C-alpha cells in the first residue's frame, strides 16, 4: 500500500532555565517507533515499538550522535531567528520541523517534505517539486536565499529519494505485524433523553485501529452534515482509538435515522440504528 | 533515520 | 500565536460503577507547548497523574495525554484541569460517562 | 459578534472568516453570505492567497468525496491547480487547509479559519 516515514522535531528555548529543549520523534505510518529527548537522564535514541528492539547497537549509537548534532544546530537557529525578527533573549520560542517521505506500492517516492514553522506558524517549506521553497515571511526569505546558495534543496532531494525511501523500506520489514494490523470499530447507538419530547442518539465507534475513521448520520438516505455533533478521535491508551457522533431527534422517530461507520478495516461500511 | 539539519 | 487547548475526559473501558477502570484527559490543539494538567477526584488532585510525551500534528498544534487509574461510582466527580498561557483562568472539564 | 473581512484580488473577491470552524462549518458560513467556500483556480491565486493571509490555517473548498471516491472542488469542476494537487498526493480521507507556505490535507472536524471566494462576472457597477 502507500507508506510514510515522518520525523517530528521540536526546539523550545526557555530563558533562565538553561539550554533549549530538543526532541526528535519518528513515525512510520502513524506509528511512533523512535524518540530522542534532550531532558531525559539518558538523552539517547530509544525504541518505542517491540519490532524496533530489533536493531543493533551500531545504529542507536549513530542516531544519538546525529541528534546531538541536530540539537546544537537548532540552538543556533533559535538565536539566528531572534536576530532576524528583532526579538529579545527574554521570550520562549518554538521551532518545529516535519521531515520525511512517502512511497507507493512499488516503494517509489510519491511526496517528500521538509516543513518548518517558528512559533506555531509556517516558516519555510520545501515545495513538492523538491527544487524550490516557499517562504512565509521576509525572515524566511533570508533562509531561502541562504539555502539557495548552499543548494539545500539539491541535498534534500537526494536524501528524500535515496536515504529516506531506503530506511522506510527496512522499518516495514522490521515490523510487518502490529503495523499492517487492523482492528475493526465495534459500534453501537445510545439513547439519551432531553427536554421537549426530543432524543439524542449517540453513535459509538470503539477499539478500532488505525485512527482514521468516518462516522456519519443520515435521515432517509441523506447525510446530516450540519445538525450533527462530533468529537475528535481520541486514543484509548491501549493502542486503539475511540470516537462518537450524535444527532438530535424527536421521540418516536428514532428509526428514521441511520449511523454509518467507515474504517479501512471494515468489509462493507457499517449501518446502525437504536 | 532522520536527516541532519542545515542551519537557517 | 497562542492557541487554546481542547479537552476530552473519558474512560478507556465501558464504565460500570464499582468496576475499576482508567480515566483519560486528552488535551489537544494548543500552543505554546508549555502546559499544566491536573486530574481531580471530587475536587482533589490525584497524586502523580501519568503524562504521555508531547507531540504535535501536521498542523503544528500540540497534543498530549494524561491518564490515571480510577473507579467510577454513581456518587463522586472526576475532572481534568488545564492551566495554559492562552487562558485567563484554568479550564476544568468534568468527566461525563455518556460522552 | 466574531470577526470577518472582505478583500478582492484580480477578478475575484474573498471573505476571510477569522472565527474557527470545521470544514462543513466553513462551507455553511459561506452560503450565508452567498459566496461559496474558496475554489483555487491556479498557482497565481494560490501565491496571492498564501502571501495575503494572516499567519494561520484556513479551510478551503477542496475535499475527499467518499461517494465519488475522489478529491473534488466545491463546484465539482477542474482547476489548473490539479497539477499541483495531484502530486501533493493526499490521503483518501479529509479536507484541505491553506497556510502561508503549505496546502495540506487533514481531518475535517478540526476548527480552522475559513475562506469564501467568488468569481466576478463583470466590473462591480
Q: Total number of helical segments of chain A?
A: 3
* Count of beta strands of chain A: 17
Tally of distinct domains of chain D: 1
Q: Could you tell me how far the N terminus lies from the C terminus of chain D, measured between alpha carbons in angstroms?
A: 30 Å
Helical stretch count of chain D? 3
Q: Tell me about the biggest sheet of chain A?
A: 8 strands, antiparallel
Secondary structure blueprint with pairings:
The complex is a heterotetramer of chains A (274), B (8), C (99) and D (125).
Chain A (H helix, E strand, L loop, with lengths): L2 E10 L8 E8 L2 E7 L8 E2 L9 H29 L8 E10 L5 E10 L2 E6 L6 E3 L2 H12 L2 H23 L11 E9 L3 E11 L4 E7 L2 E2 L5 E2 L3 E2 L5 E10 L6 E7 L6 E3 L2
Chain C lengths: L5 E6 L9 E10 L5 E6 L2 E2 L4 E2 L3 E2 L5 E9 L7 E6 L7 E4 L5
Antiparallel strand pairs in C: 1-2, 2-7, 3-4, 3-8, 5-7, 6-7, 8-9
Chain D lengths: L3 E6 L2 E10 L1 H9 L11 H10 L5 E8 L4 E4 L8 H7 L6 E4 L4 E4 L5 E8 L6
Parallel strand pairs in D: 3-7
Antiparallel strand pairs in D: 1-2, 2-7, 3-4, 3-5, 5-6
Function (chain A): Involved in the presentation of foreign antigens to the immune system.
GO molecular function (chain A): peptide antigen binding
Subcellular location (chain A): Membrane
For this entry, give a set of tags.
heterotetramer; C: 99 residues; mainly beta; Immunoglobulin-like; five-stranded antiparallel beta sheet; four-stranded antiparallel beta sheet; 0% helix; D: 125 residues; alpha+beta; Mannose-Binding Protein A, Chain A; seven-stranded mixed beta sheet; 3 helices; immunity (chain C); disulfide bond (chain C); Beta-2-microglobulin (chain C)
Can you tell me about this structure?
The complex is a heterotetramer of chains A (274), B (8), C (99) and D (125). Chain A has helices at 57-85, 138-149, 152-174; strands spanning 3-12, 21-28, 31-37, 46-47, 94-103, 109-118, 121-126, 133-135, 186-194, 198-208, 213-219, 222-223, 229-230, 234-235, 241-250, 257-263, 270-272. Chain A is of the alpha+beta class. In chain A, a hairpin with a 2-residue loop joins strand 2 (21-28) and strand 3 (31-37). Chain C is mainly beta and 99 residues long. Chain C contains no helices and 9 strands. Chain C has strands spanning 6-11, 21-30, 36-41, 44-45, 50-51, 55-56, 62-70, 78-83, 91-94. Chains in contact: A-B, A-C, A-D, C-D.
Provide a brief overview of the structure:
Chain B is low in regular secondary structure and 8 residues long. Helix content of chain B is 0%, strand content 0%. The termini of chain D are far apart.
